[PDB]
């Protein structure tokens, strides 16, 4: 399970999906939205083994052709499957709208 | 454009799909697969920028997350789009039997 529920509990490097909330302003100093200042974005971060949940049929064969190869960084690449909306709101000109962008958060990582 | 046409052309770092040629046992040692030898799995390495084609919204979220804060490997992950099978060749006890490998390939990435 490679989602935000066992990542989010012990360690992890392989394609486990890690905490990755971004202040709108701070990290990305998005001007076009107002609030919220920021959210829990999350994010997958390192490669993964073979029986690792593979999606496609070459996440199973590269996954071991650097599993098989020490020194090569060719490996896969965790990713964001699921992902979730994000109720901010912005302003166009002078009317304020509030919104919930799509895809504006993730809910599960994989290894595309 | 990232695929494989744009870059097997000249130099590229961030979201661009690489040649990764995988002989089927000199990488994976795959013992059930007799041929071919190996064949063009390509694959991709590198993040992507904002305008890089983005997948998902959190495509262009986080890929100004990495490219504002320097220092973060959180950005994104570059992965096999569309894939390709391949026609191969194994043994099954005693009858040899030709198949084709779904998404055994690649043939463009992306950002997910």
């Given amino acids: 399970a490679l ?3 066992y990542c989010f509990s012990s360690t992890e490097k392989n394609c486990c999906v890690r905490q990755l909330y971004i202040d709108f302003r701070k990290d990305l100093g998005w001007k076009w939205i ?3 200042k920021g959210y829990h974005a999350n ?3 390192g490669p993964c083994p073979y029986i690792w949940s593979l999606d496609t049929q070459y996440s199973k064969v590269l996954a071991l052709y650097n599993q098989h190869n020490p020194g090569a960084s060719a490996a896969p690449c965790c990713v964001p499957q699921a992902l979730e909306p994000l109720p ?3 302003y166009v000109g002078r009317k304020p709208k509030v919104e919930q962008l799509s ?3 993730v809910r599960s990582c994989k290894c595309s």
Avoid: A, G, K
Wanted: charged share 15%; proline share 7%.
């Fill in 43 to 45: 994010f997958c971060l």
């Fill in 34 to 36: 107002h609030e919220p």
């Fill in 88 to 90: 901010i709101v912005y």
């Fill in 103 to 105: 895809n504006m958060i």
């Fill in 3 to 5: 989602d935000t529920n």
